Every structure is written in C-alpha cells, then in structure tokens.
Design a protein around this ligand. Sequence first.
Ligand SMILES: Cc1cn([C@H]2C[C@H](O)[C@@H](COP(=O)(O)OP(=O)(O)O)O2)c(=O)[nH]c1=O
Ligand SMILES: Cc1cn([C@H]2C[C@H](O)[C@@H](COP(=O)(O)OP(=O)(O)O)O2)c(=O)[nH]c1=O
Ligand SMILES: Cc1cn([C@H]2C[C@H](O)[C@@H](COP(=O)(O)OP(=O)(O)O)O2)c(=O)[nH]c1=O
Ligand SMILES: Cc1cn([C@H]2C[C@H](O)[C@@H](COP(=O)(O)OP(=O)(O)O)O2)c(=O)[nH]c1=O
Ligand SMILES: Cc1cn([C@H]2C[C@H](O)[C@@H](COP(=O)(O)OP(=O)(O)O)O2)c(=O)[nH]c1=O
Ligand SMILES: Cc1cn([C@H]2C[C@H](O)[C@@H](COP(=O)(O)OP(=O)(O)O)O2)c(=O)[nH]c1=O
Lengths: 154, 153, 154, 154, 153, 154
Amino acid sequence: SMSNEQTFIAIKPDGVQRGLIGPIISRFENRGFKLVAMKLVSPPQSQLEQHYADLSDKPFFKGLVSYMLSGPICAMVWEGRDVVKTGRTILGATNPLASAPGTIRGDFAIDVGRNVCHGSDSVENAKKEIALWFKPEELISWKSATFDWVYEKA
Amino acid sequence: MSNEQTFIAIKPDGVQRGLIGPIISRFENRGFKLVAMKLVSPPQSQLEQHYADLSDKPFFKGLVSYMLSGPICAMVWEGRDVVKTGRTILGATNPLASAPGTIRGDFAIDVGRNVCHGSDSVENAKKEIALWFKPEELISWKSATFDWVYEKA
Amino acid sequence: SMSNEQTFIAIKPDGVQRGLIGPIISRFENRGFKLVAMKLVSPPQSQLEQHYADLSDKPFFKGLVSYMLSGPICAMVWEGRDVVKTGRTILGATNPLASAPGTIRGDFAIDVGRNVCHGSDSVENAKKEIALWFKPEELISWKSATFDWVYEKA
Amino acid sequence: SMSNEQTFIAIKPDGVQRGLIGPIISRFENRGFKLVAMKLVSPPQSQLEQHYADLSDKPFFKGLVSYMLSGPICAMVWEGRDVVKTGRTILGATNPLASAPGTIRGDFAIDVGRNVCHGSDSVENAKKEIALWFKPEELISWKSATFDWVYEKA
Amino acid sequence: MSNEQTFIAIKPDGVQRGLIGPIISRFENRGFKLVAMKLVSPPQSQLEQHYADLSDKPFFKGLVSYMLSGPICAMVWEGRDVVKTGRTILGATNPLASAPGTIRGDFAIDVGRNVCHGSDSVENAKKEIALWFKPEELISWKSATFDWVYEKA
Amino acid sequence: SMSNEQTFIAIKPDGVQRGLIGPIISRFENRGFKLVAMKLVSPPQSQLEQHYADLSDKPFFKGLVSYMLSGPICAMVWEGRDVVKTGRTILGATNPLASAPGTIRGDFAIDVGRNVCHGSDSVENAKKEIALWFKPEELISWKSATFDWVYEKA
Ligand SMILES: Cc1cn([C@H]2C[C@H](O)[C@@H](COP(=O)(O)OP(=O)(O)O)O2)c(=O)[nH]c1=O
Ligand SMILES: Cc1cn([C@H]2C[C@H](O)[C@@H](COP(=O)(O)OP(=O)(O)O)O2)c(=O)[nH]c1=O
Ligand SMILES: Cc1cn([C@H]2C[C@H](O)[C@@H](COP(=O)(O)OP(=O)(O)O)O2)c(=O)[nH]c1=O
Ligand SMILES: Cc1cn([C@H]2C[C@H](O)[C@@H](COP(=O)(O)OP(=O)(O)O)O2)c(=O)[nH]c1=O
Ligand SMILES: Cc1cn([C@H]2C[C@H](O)[C@@H](COP(=O)(O)OP(=O)(O)O)O2)c(=O)[nH]c1=O
Ligand SMILES: Cc1cn([C@H]2C[C@H](O)[C@@H](COP(=O)(O)OP(=O)(O)O)O2)c(=O)[nH]c1=O
C-alpha cells in the first residue's frame, strides 16, 4: 500500500541479553524502513498478558509471559511500505527451526520460546500493539533524507 | 562455462544510498571475477536502447528519467552460471518478493527503486555488455584462487 | 573504577538520518557495556539549550541548537567500568578531522557540526545529562548474562 | 530432540585457502550453537576414504579424495538443538548452484566440487564422523553463559 | 572546501585478494562522494609517470612491474579534506606501521603489497586525477545526504 | 624479518564464552597471516602455570590461572612476516582500557583480567609457547594461494 504503514517490532529479553540490539536494528535500517518510535522498557506483567491476550489458553502462555518479563525489551515502531509483511519476513519464520538463513532468526535463533524478537502479524494488530506499547507522542514525525531514493511513490 | 559473463549495474538509488561497496562485496565473496567497471552517466538514448524490449510498457517513461537521475556503476562479472546465479544474488526483481540474504532482500523495497540490474540471460548479457562497454574496457586477468573456486572449466 | 559507572550517549539527527543507529549501538554492545536506557526522542529546545548551557555564548550556539532540532535523536545510557572515558574513545575525537579510523567518527563523520554522536566528557557531567534526558524510571535495572566474563571484579 | 545433539562440520581446503575460517565459524557462533571440538588437520588418505566410503565407486571419488588432501581442513564438532539439520541448512545446498544467498555456500561457493565445507547429513552419520575425526578427549565439555537465553528447555 | 578531490587506486593485490568492496565501503561510510571510478590496466608509461618522483629509488623497477601485474580500480573521491583524511583511512604507507582500523592495518603487511594508493597532497591529487582520468569520466552529482554530512560548503 | 615467522595466539575462555572465535580469527585472516595450527583444548593447570611461569609470584597469578581454567581455549599458531609484533598490535594493548578501537581488545574487551586473547610478546617466547602448547606434528605445512599477493619477498 502506502509508504506510511507502521508495524510494532520488539527485541525480546534474550535478544537484549545476547547483544543483538544493534544487528536487529540494522536489518530494518538497511532495508529502508524508518524508525519512528523506540524505547527500552521492562513492562509489567499485565501489559504483556494483554499483548498476548489471544494466546491465554495456549499451553505455553505462562512460560512465554515469564520469559518476556525476565529482562528488558527494546520496543520499536517501524514505518514503510508493506513494513508489516516484509518486517515479518526480515524476522524469519516464527519457529527458528523453519527460518531461512539471512533472516534474523535464521542467523541468531534456535528455540521458538527464545526466538529473539516479535513482529506484528497484520496491519490491524500492528495499530493495536502500537497503541498498547506507545503513547502517541512517542512516535516522532520526520522524513528520511533518502525517501525519494527508497521509494518511487508515496 | 566458467568464462560466462553477465552485466551488473548499480542504479542511481544504489549509488545515492551508499551501496557500492556492499554490492561489489556480494559478488566478490561469491567468487566471481570483475572484468570491467566504470561509474557512468549514460545518455538517454543508450538507456532507451537498454530498456528497448519494454518501450511500450506503462512504466517505461519514469524508468528512463530515474536511470538518468544519478550515476550508474556498470560492471561485467565473469564466472560459471554468473547470469543465473548473479540474478539470484540480486534477488527477485520486485523487492517485496525478494528474500533476506539477497541484495534487494537486504536493501530495497520498491521495484522502481530495486537498486541494481542484472542480465536475465546469457544472450541478453552479451548484448548489454556490448551496449554498455567498449571492448577495450573488459580487462583480462586470472584470479589467484581460480583453482580453489572452480574444480574444472 | 567500578563497573556500574554510567554515561550518556546520544545519536544526533545526522546519525539517525544516515542510518547509523545499528552500527553505533553495536560498537557499545560488542565492547561489553550494558544499555540501561534508550529512547527515540525529539526534545524541546529548552532541554537542548540547557544541555549546551556551557556554550550559550559561543558563536555557533544557535546553529547547533537548530541542527539538534532538525530530526530525531537516539538517547542512550550505557553502563560499564570507565564507560565515560572509554565511550569517548569509542566515539573518537569530537572533531572527526582529528579522529582515528576504527572509532565511530573515524568511520562515519567528517564535520564537527555533523559528528553524528555525543558523549559525556566526565562522570559528573554524565550524571547531569542522564538526569536531564531521562526520568529515573526510564533506567532499567538488569544483569547481563556474561557479566562475569566481561569483568574480573567490581 | 535435545540441545546436546552434535554434528560434524568441516571446512574443506578451498574454504581454508580462500580465508573463510572466521566467517564460517561466526555463522555457527551467531546462531547459538556450542563449539565442543576443533582442530586444523591434514588427515591421512585412508581416513578421508573412510569418510567418503559410500562414494568409493562414484566416478569423482579419486578427484574428491585428492582435493580433500590438497590443503588443511578445519574439523569441528558443534552442539545444539537440531544442529545436524539446521547446520546443513546454514551451509546451504550441497551444490552451491542450488544454494540460497545468506547461507555459507550461497555467499561463497560456486562449484559442488569446491563447496568450501561439509556437514553431517544425519544424527547417526554425525556420530560416525565425530568418532572418525576426533579422539574422545578432544571433545571439550563446557556450558555457555547464555545457554538459558538460547534454549527454553534442555 | 567540500569539493576537494583525491586519487584513490586499488592496487593489483587488493583486486586479487577480493578487497574492492571493503575499500569502497570505507570511503562510502565516511561520507565521501565517488565521482569517478574504472577498472583499468594502464600502460607502463602511465605508471612510470605516476611514480615519477621515485625513478631514482631502488624499488622503482619492482614497483612498476608489480603495478603492471593485475587490474587496478582507479577512483576519484570528493569531500572536505579528502586528500589527508583519505591518507589516514588508508593507513601508514608501510602496513607494519599502520594501525588496525585503517585499510592497511586491516589487510596488508608489506609496503610492496600495500593494497591501495592515495594522493599525498592536494596538488599531487590534481596531477594524478588528470593523468588517470579523462575529464568526461568525472561525474557531477549531489548526494542526497550532503546537508547531513556537511554543515557548510 | 622473513615470512615464515610464527606466533602463538590463544583465545581465552571469556572470548570463547562471548562468541568471539570467528571475529578474532577473521582479524588475522584478513591481515594476510596464515593459520598453521589450531585446536580447542582444556589444558591442565600445570601447563597454564608453565605458560605464565614468568609471572609466578605476581599478585594476580592464581586468579589468572583459575580464569584460564574456567573454560575452553582456542590455541592457534599464525605465520607471517612480523606476525609476533603485528599480532600483538592486532590484539591491542594488554589492558583494554589502554587499547585503541579497531583492535581486538579495543572492540571487545574491558578488564585486563578478561582481555579475551593472548599473544606471544617475542619471537623467542613464541617458539617456547608453540612447543609448549602444540606437538610438532600439529603444525600443518602449506602455502596460501595468495602468498605472492600478500608478500613482495620471502
Ligand atoms: C508455539 C509457541 C509460540 N510461542 C510464541 C511465538 C509466537 O510469538 C506466539 C505464537 O505464535 P505462533 O502461532 O506459534 O506462530 P505465528 O505468529 O507465525 O502465527 O507465541 C512461544 O513463545 N512458545 C511456543 O511454544
Ligand atoms: C514492473 C516494473 C518493472 N520495472 C523494471 C524492472 C525490471 O528491471 C524490468 C522488467 O520488469 P519484469 O518483467 O516485471 O521483471 P523481470 O526482469 O524478472 O522480467 O522492468 C520497473 O522499472 N518498474 C516497474 O514497475
Ligand atoms: C567548535 C564546534 C563545536 N560544536 C559542538 C560539538 C560538540 O558537540 C561541542 C563540544 O565542543 P568542544 O568543546 O570543542 O569538544 P569537547 O566535547 O571534547 O569538549 O561543541 C559544534 O557543534 N560546532 C562547532 O563548530
Ligand atoms: C556429485 C559430486 C559430489 N561431490 C561431493 C559433494 C558431496 O560433499 C559428496 C557427496 O554428496 P552428495 O551425495 O553428492 O549430495 P548430498 O549430501 O545432498 O546427498 O560428494 C563432489 O565432490 N563432486 C561431485 O560431482
Ligand atoms: C619504500 C617502498 C615504497 N614503495 C612504494 C610505496 C609508496 O607507494 C611509494 C613510496 O612511498 P614512501 O616514500 O615510501 O611513503 P609515503 O607515500 O608516505 O611518502 O613507493 C614501494 O613500492 N616499495 C618500497 O619499498
Ligand atoms: C596486570 C595483569 C596482567 N594479567 C595478565 C594479562 C596478560 O595476559 C599477562 C601479562 O600482563 P602484563 O605483563 O602486565 O602486560 P604485557 O603483556 O604488556 O607485558 O598477565 C592479568 O591477568 N591480570 C593483571 O592484572
């Protein structure tokens, strides 16, 4: 669609602990996407259980929440055309065992419960997660100097 | 078969975004041999000759003025299946269908800003090479690791 | 020198515009320093003037504040032994003309008015800048998994 | 499928000659696998023929054995969950013509007879090759500091 | 000031060892603008004229023969203080005295195989640029991040 | 002064624990040096005390020996012109606080008790260390395909 689509990208505590904050950001930076919001946070359990509210009945829900609480999280919002779908492709398959080398999980991850990062799965869930993690004023409005070279259209 | 040549060009957006080094390293690391290269600003006639097979498609007009909007790094790479493997390295022509690990899969988004161009066949490469380079610009040399890259041919 | 010393590292708008957020973070990640606070901000001019209060009489002061307002800023707090001193060495000479390759400015910068990044030049100035740019709750407390492999003591 | 599965990865003489020791090792280090054994060796021809015993009748056998004798080999044992299959995916397709960029052969190789590396194709074959190339005391036993961050279970 | 130019050349050992990409990335990442580049095998007379200030040194004949042994990636980079900063990026001419982080400190050992060359002065840059490049081969363009690299002209 | 000079480079347990094996090997590969011997070993305490015998009554000797036993070591022998002196320069200053960014320790280490790597400080000390760590048949004899492009003379 348009060049101002947004998604929610989070670096899970294992990605922070293993020193992958820089490399993960570079994947989206080099691809041509724009970072409009970022912050390192340790959110409370209530916020994490709301982010994973659709999985509260899954058997792995309790362990996932405790692991998302075990360390700091680098929450981000990236902007660009098809940033939701292409962003998930940059992260690789949700299960690292099925991820392709060259993707983030294909280069860095093994277990699905330690798959380093999170990405919104749809445009609707991206807006939901952006409002859950960020105040509207935490999204900075700016235009990349190389916009006309990344994009042929708005 | 190892003397097969292809034409690889870095489009103005690739030059503008500072991608000359990483793109050349991608072919260097694969083991291909660079036999010709120049930073060029070709005339509009040569570009329309390059995209001659697409002169009636709707996107032809904007394609010419955008290839004219900046310098182009033209290259000729030599190696076994360098035409097919070269395009695989560049990734899918539309970056939305490209895979991470390829040039477009790591750097591009829009098809009109897909950073690079690669010949799609051996015969088209031979024509693009003749159009973009004069014969004296193809340098003849042998890589010191040629026998470690190739088992034969 | 204790391992809990903190410093303030900021990626200036030219650093964000030129796609240097990833590599700059990786320089401090690979060295062994701990990121305890980070956020993408567009701070008000009063905060920027107060940050450069020592330079309010300098001739380049108004152009400096204006350039620091021209885009997003990645503000960071890094923690480690001698991180203030070593962080400045990682950034390189404030004038990139005098910086050495291998540092951030020796690799990416040219002009002193566009030197991509900022670093506190003293422990006490770091405490002042961290309190100026960050709220106390924005500094996340956590323990690196390889702490005992980076540090022999303290 | 536990996290102590082991595989045999070897850097062939062409990979050694072309300076690919570091990059190949980084591919396995970054993914999260543990290196338990490594040594630069120029093994006798009988060991190489035993390694490729299932190919002793193939036409390219003597040319393959001579090529495996033409220089040093970096023999390695990597340990991790599903390291045999994922290791083969990291190396790429056996014939680099069919390999994907982002894998080892998709980034550095061209000819199948010069595919820079080898990896075990099954768990049982891995145990055969580990015993073939390594004496038992050459397997180093240790625990990564980030084990609980790479894996969610044993 | 910002339109200063220097001559950077990747010597045959840099091309043979697959260092074209990494060397270009060093100047690209720093913020300098590539205005001219070509892969060329220049004649011996051009190389003897390039090192004319060394025709009395004993290593002169060996220097010319080794510069003839392979392709050379001749470049022209433009930027503020690009001559001096370019020399600093290359490192000490003798790699044993170069610091890691520079090109020679990362890739070279012997001074007779020091991978690259850079102009030592602004006026020697103009002579080397005019010797290696016709005026047409220099491309005039403006980087989209010029106002983010430089604060003033 | 010749090109067959040899030195002993060892990646200490912290370098192995922090995933720096590949990057460190790449530093010497890129420079043009030749790896003639390498093995991952867990050496006995006597060999380590025999290795650091010239520090037998320094205050840090017992802790240094314990730290060298706390994990696997990647022991290497690199060969090239002035590899002993240039190797130490590549590693950086023994104390990472005094090392320059761009070197191994300037990029990766902080404490001298966790300085990641070790290099021989003289040609004579290198010969003693190489014989102390490696059996003579563990040194592989081979010539790089790019020798004449790295060296102008023998
Ligand atoms: C199956 C599983 C998923 N998860 C996580 C991964 C995912 O982020 C989320 C469930 O997503 P999932 O349905 O498994 O994959 P996808 O997002 O592609 O549809 O929960 C775990 O943490 N542990 C698990 O065991
Ligand atoms: C569709 C499209 C193609 N092109 C260019 C890209 C390609 O180099 C060329 C051919 O497009 P296309 O035939 O769709 O892909 P392929 O090269 O695999 O056959 O046309 C544009 O510049 N803009 C466009 O919108
Ligand atoms: C001289 C100068 C400084 N500055 C800014 C850059 C630096 O962020 C700030 C510090 O200047 P300076 O005191 O010279 O360096 P240091 O931080 O090591 O004490 O002044 C400019 O923006 N433009 C200038 O022309
Ligand atoms: C076909 C072929 C294989 N080989 C090598 C590659 C392989 O390492 C080995 C046998 O592997 P192979 O059976 O060909 O592929 P796969 O592992 O997918 O079953 O023989 C050659 O050296 N030359 C050849 O022509
Ligand atoms: C000393 C020496 C220099 N050269 C080359 C390096 C240089 O490119 C040129 C002489 O440079 P030199 O005077 O040694 O150093 P600088 O460039 O700093 O003035 O000749 C050799 O080829 N062999 C040599 O032995
Ligand atoms: C000073 C010091 C050294 N060491 C180790 C690091 C080095 O591997 C070894 C030599 O130290 P040192 O002799 O002080 O440095 P140099 O190599 O320049 O002579 O001793 C420690 O482990 N702890 C220390 O406090």
